[PDB]
Enzyme design. Structure first.
Site, PDB file in Angstrom:
ATOM      1  N   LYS A 165      25.561 -51.545  85.810  1.00 10.63           N
ATOM      2  CA  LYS A 165      24.372 -50.708  85.572  1.00 10.63           C
ATOM      3  C   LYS A 165      23.080 -51.333  86.069  1.00 10.63           C
ATOM      4  O   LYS A 165      21.995 -50.953  85.629  1.00 10.63           O
ATOM      5  CB  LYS A 165      24.229 -50.301  84.085  1.00 10.63           C
ATOM      6  N   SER A 181      21.467 -47.910  79.879  1.00  5.17           N
ATOM      7  CA  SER A 181      22.275 -47.332  80.961  1.00  5.17           C
ATOM      8  C   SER A 181      23.777 -47.453  80.689  1.00  5.17           C
ATOM      9  O   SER A 181      24.540 -46.512  80.936  1.00  5.17           O
ATOM     10  CB  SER A 181      21.910 -47.976  82.308  1.00  5.17           C
ATOM     11  N   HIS A 195      31.828 -56.766  89.755  1.00  5.01           N
ATOM     12  CA  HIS A 195      31.048 -57.090  88.563  1.00  5.01           C
ATOM     13  C   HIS A 195      31.496 -58.407  87.928  1.00  5.01           C
ATOM     14  O   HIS A 195      31.087 -58.727  86.810  1.00  5.01           O
ATOM     15  CB  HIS A 195      31.160 -55.988  87.505  1.00  5.01           C
TER      16      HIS A 195
END
Ligand SMILES: Nc1ncnc2c1ncn2[C@@H]1O[C@H](COP(=O)(O)O)[C@@H](OP(=O)(O)O)[C@H]1O
Ligand SMILES: O=[N+]([O-])c1ccc(O)cc1
Ligand SMILES: O=[N+]([O-])c1ccc(O)cc1
Length: 289
Positions: free
Chosen positions: A43, A133, A103
């Protein structure tokens, strides 16, 4: 049911059950010297920078960047879900130069990236905007466990009990890593304030000099108002079972400072006290507005 499962520890980090199950495949991933790795805590502007990079690689050609969805153009390396997707295999079959999304916390990155001395673009975003988010994303993106209430999710985020682990450790360790490897460390807030300046940073890092007119094309097509309506970038090509945009759209608000709309004053004060303790022994500096 591949959806809504509990996370599974992988070398200290909570990851999706199917990533854990196929971890050796991720660990042994073969990088290439000209791979560009886009690395983010979830995010933090992954899609935004991925689109920018694909636009740069295609000289701002909007139609070429619509050849497929962003998640196929820029594979999410470690995301492997049986019957649905395999980032490692997508990348294995992709021609160079590859743009790779991850990630993974630094300590979990496949060692081939280090051995190949790849250039890495890391994007960070202020923690408060990230958790907001991520909350709405947890709701819409069904691979995640149930987020619970905002209050419950906020506590899980602070405790690092969310997919990909603690934000604090993620950003801090990737920051330290910039002294060992070629990491352009960017901030979502800087891209909001002056996208031209940040794209110029990316171009310099990539050792590319392009005409002002192409730079302006890239700027136009990577704006929130354009990307939010672009089916190749906005994740609306996902099956509803995987991502339900009616719950929350992927391209949600695209601002800095939405945390003010979500955090109670008490939650904010508590978060800040915790944050200072976790971050004071790092030179990393963020803006929240
Ligand atoms: N072109 C753009 N400009 C600004 N923000 C963007 C953007 N494209 C995506 N975003 C925002 O980046 C976040 C998603 O990040 P990631 O791609 O790493 O999952 C979402 O934030 P919000 O949920 O705060 O709106 C999304 O709206
Ligand atoms: O199926 N999914 O939920 C996906 C598949 C691919 C991707 O990169 C992200 C999410
Ligand atoms: O679970 N998901 O579908 C995801 C999770 C993270 C991400 O960046 C994209 C898709």
């Amino acid at each position: 049911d591949v959806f809504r499962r509990e996370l599974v520890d992988v070398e200290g980090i909570p990851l999706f059950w199917s990533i854990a199950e196929h971890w050796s495949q991720v660990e042994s991933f073969e990088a290439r010297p000209d791979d560009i790795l886009i690395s983010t805590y979830p995010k933090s502007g992954t899609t935004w920078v991925s689109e920018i990079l694909d636009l740069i690689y295609n000289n701002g050609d909007a139609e070429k960047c619509k050849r497929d969805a962003i998640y196929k153009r820029v594979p999410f390396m470690e995301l492997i879900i049986p019957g649905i997707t395999n980032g490692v295999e997508m990348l294995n079959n992709m021609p160079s130069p590859r743009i790779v999304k991850t990630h993974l916390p630094v300590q979990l990155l496949p060692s081939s990236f280090w051995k190949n001395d790849c250039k890495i673009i890391y994007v960070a975003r202020n923690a408060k905007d990230v958790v907001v988010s991520y909350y709405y994303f947890y709701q819409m993106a069904k691979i995640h466990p149930e987020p619970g209430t905002w209050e419950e999710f906020l506590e899980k985020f602070m405790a690092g009990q969310v997919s990909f682990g603690p934000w604090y450790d993620h950003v801090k360790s990737w920051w330290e890593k910039r002294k060992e490897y070629r990491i352009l460390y960017l901030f979502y807030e800087d891209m909001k304030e002056n996208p031209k300046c940040e794209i110029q940073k990316i171009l310099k890092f990539l050792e590319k000099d392009i005409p002002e007119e192409i730079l302006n094309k890239i700027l136009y097509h990577s704006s929130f108002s354009v990307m939010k309506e672009n089916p190749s970038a906005n994740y609306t090509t996902m099956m509803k079972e995987e991502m339900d945009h009616s719950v929350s759209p992927f391209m949600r608000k695209g601002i800095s400072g939405d945390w003010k709309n979500q955090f109670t004053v008490a939650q904010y004060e508590k978060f800040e006290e915790d944050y200072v303790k976790k971050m004071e022994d790092s030179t990393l500096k963020f803006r929240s507005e």
